[PDB]
């Protein structure tokens, strides 16, 4: 029932080249596809070192004809940063190339440095990024329908022309596969996530970043309530939840490999300090009954990360399902194993083939 | 030596899918690279049937790690259609992925239907309206500054954009400057006799790409270009000049001609290109050169008098003759046609052009 997914930020070690990063992305897509992973989400960042993909569509396109079954999604295209017509056209064309193995993450962008680059001062505090998202979506949906219009917006002018006065002289068809909008997704983190409400209101796919039991429950509560009120039927099998996940033959090996390898390195060098600064471990702290100040690597490995043998990880997931109601896709956060992929590819294969099929049905 | 290049519009037969088009592009890039073709230019169109690539960068990215030596160029990114920061970031990143096997065509866009989609009414005409050429100049201004990674903010007529100061190695800004930290080489195409693009190109030391329309225009392009270059203080270099031609080589003149007349090339010309060329007076240069009335310029006339078609010796002679008449050029940019269903004769032609013809061409 539960699918396995990859989310590729990618947390490349500072100093990796663009070609190395791109090669690791393609290799990751091909391997994930080969072990039955259902989706690969690729994030977008123009200002960050570790999250060093500014154009997830380039990777998706390079992996498209090298894979069979896996579905790709930008997670997310930052709508305030591009002309909606240009973006809508690219999405539809890529969706066509993939024969529908595609869905669309949309976002405002959480990094003011990148907002600034794209002409939006004071994104942290004028232009409103959320209004820009709404206007872009309004324009893109119309372009995908291939119904003519011209729109003079607050943020952009855009349109879709009427045919001029042989099939070869009609307008190109860059509508997404099947001629309909792709499925749209949005991520959420905070406890009362406005993204989850938007998602529910518009029947988008919710993607939650695991921050603790209370938030995971609250996300679904907010989502479904918004869905119901908007007249949609909430479907928990749509819900994707992003986790650190690592599987090996034993609990001991699993833990050692995380502690001493790429995952532990990224967390100690980069993620733990950010998470500390921004209070992103308060949910985990609450769940385990500790002070956030004492949330270190080994705490996360023992209490938060889905780490261990296939049986252990299966248990941990099933325990979360009983506590929170569950989810449709386990979205595994990718790490920089480009130097020595074997233990990481073995983990993914275990998660996908041995863990995921044994998970309980999610709460309706 | 004169180099061989490919220019991929493409001219896909109406009815080809996006996946087929994309597959043909990758196959074409791989094959061109394998036979020593120096560059592959890929054009950008959102409204056209035959020219059905709206995002050349997706193709370039998919071919990047599958090729060794060939250089790629969008020909051209239509600068009025996207946010210059987003575009500048993607160009730098792709340039990095390609390790500098990349140059940048820029353009305004010659299809009003597509201009309309991107919020530009009355692109065909010379509140107040939008000027595509001014939009090109503002985009380039912004992109060059972003590539330099020096902070600024610009509130333009068409866009707001900037480059931020560092916040008060992993926490510094990402570096998506192009390969070597400098702007890519910039190219523009020209067609008309007194091409304003050729003047711009000369003024700014861009690479000129001429679309072959006759002896007089080819000479006039270089005259305009070099005069502008010299006045701007640049040294005009003919080896930079790319000239776009229909080119087809086979073992004999008879085979070459039959394959063009009866195959994909002839089909595209009779069904699509000849009527357009007739309507817009694009055969007047060829007519003048051969001493005929444009009304009588049909397929076989183009094959016998204009297209570089024949045996390797014959095509070598035709090129050498053009070199004596006009002064020559640095790259023979072969216009690609839809041989996706029959690649053998077309790949054979490109191999002949690249290995047997081009090395025998006299100095420009
Ligand atoms: O670097 S800056 O200080 O400019 C912005 C840093 N900020 C930290 C918090 N994360 C939340 C990710 S999410 O899990 O809430 O989606 C967004 C980025
Ligand atoms: O389709 S529309 O009728 O709306 C515009 C027609 N127009 C005809 C001429 N071509 C040649 C490009 S070039 O050869 O001059 O570079 C550009 C498009
Ligand atoms: Cl992020
Ligand atoms: Cl529904
Ligand atoms: Cl064109
Ligand atoms: Cl010079």
Residue numbers in the entry:
A (entry chain B): 2 to 126, 136 to 175, 180 to 378
B (entry chain A): 2 to 127, 134 to 175, 181 to 376
What does the study report here?
Initial structural characterization studies of 3,6-DKMO by our group were with the native enzyme purified from camphor-induced P. putida cell cultures. The native 3,6-DKMO crystallized in space group P212121, with unit-cell parameters a = 55.0, b = 93.4, c = 162.0 Å. The crystals that were grown in 50 mM PIPES pH 6.5, 50% ammonium sulfate contained two DKMO subunits in the asymmetric unit with a solvent content of 50%. The native 3,6-DKMO model also contains 798 water molecules, several glycerol molecules, four sulfate ions and two PIPES buffer molecules. The two subunits of the native structure were rebuilt independently. The root-mean-square deviation (r.m.s.d.) between Cα positions of the two subunits is 0.23 Å. In the course of the purification of the 3,6-DKMO enzyme the cofactor FMN is easily lost, especially if an ammonium sulfate precipitation step is used in the purification procedure, since the inorganic sulfate competes for the cofactor-binding site. The following residues were not modelled owing to disorder: A1, A128–133, A176–180, A377–378, B1, B127–135 and B176–179 in the native structure and A126–135, A176–179, A377–378, B125–135 and B176–179 in the FMN-complex structure.
